[PDB]
Ligand binder design. Structure first.
Ligand SMILES: Nc1nc2c(ncn2[C@@H]2O[C@H](COP(=O)(O)OP(=O)(O)O)[C@@H](O)[C@H]2O)c(=O)[nH]1
Ligand SMILES: [Mg+2]
Length: 168
């Protein structure tokens, strides 16, 4: 039987959670994907020679019922905490999600990657690579910049996260 890995996408609105999920899943950039939809996706992928299945839960703010949210988080094995390099407030918001995840999983070593998305909009960058890295260092997690549009580092973030999961 193939090993199953559960990944959870978290972050504020419009940072690219759905766009990253769909690029990785179906290899296509889907613009204006319905913002209030939360859904799960699964498929087989090859990680370092081994065939495994990845399950991705794409969350949305609309679903704010505590019991439901906490259940989704407790079921996740790794998290991609996404923000938009073009929105300073989304970067600041990452602290909020980090707090909720730590509250529910009580594990400061839980597989977690800080993801700065929309790297293709460099000319609108409001968050420098320096400040993002400093924060990542403080939480002892790695930082990766992606673009759901050009697909830069998209496979890398999911793959790197699965590797951390594989080691815990
Ligand atoms: N240029 C650019 N736009 C992006 C990127 N990722 C998402 N977007 C756009 O940002 C908007 C919000 O994306 P969405 O995936 O719905 O964000 P979510 O609310 O986090 O699920 C959509 O209009 C996307 O087409 C990216 O990497 N580059
Ligand atoms: Mg979405």
């Amino acid at each position: 039987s193939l090993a199953l890995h559960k990944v959870i996408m978290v972050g504020s609105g419009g940072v690219g959670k759905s766009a990253l999920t769909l690029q990785f899943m179906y290899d296509e950039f889907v613009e204006d994907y319905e913002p209030t939809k939360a859904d799960s996706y699964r498929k087989k992928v090859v990680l370092d020679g081994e065939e495994v299945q990845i399950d991705i839960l794409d969350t949305a703010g609309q679903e704010d019922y505590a019991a439901i949210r906490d259940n989704y988080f407790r079921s996740g094995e790794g998290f991609l905490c996404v923000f938009s390099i073009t929105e300073m407030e989304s970067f600041a918001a990452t602290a909020d999600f980090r707090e909720q995840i730590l509250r529910v999983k009580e594990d400061e070593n839980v597989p977690f990657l800080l993801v700065g998305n929309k790297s293709d909009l460099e000319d609108k960058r409001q968050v420098s690579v320096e400040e993002a890295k400093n924060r990542a260092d403080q939480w002892n997690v790695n930082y990766v910049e992606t673009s759901a549009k050009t697909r830069a580092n998209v496979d890398k973030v999911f793959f790197d996260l699965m590797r951390e999961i594989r080691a815990r």
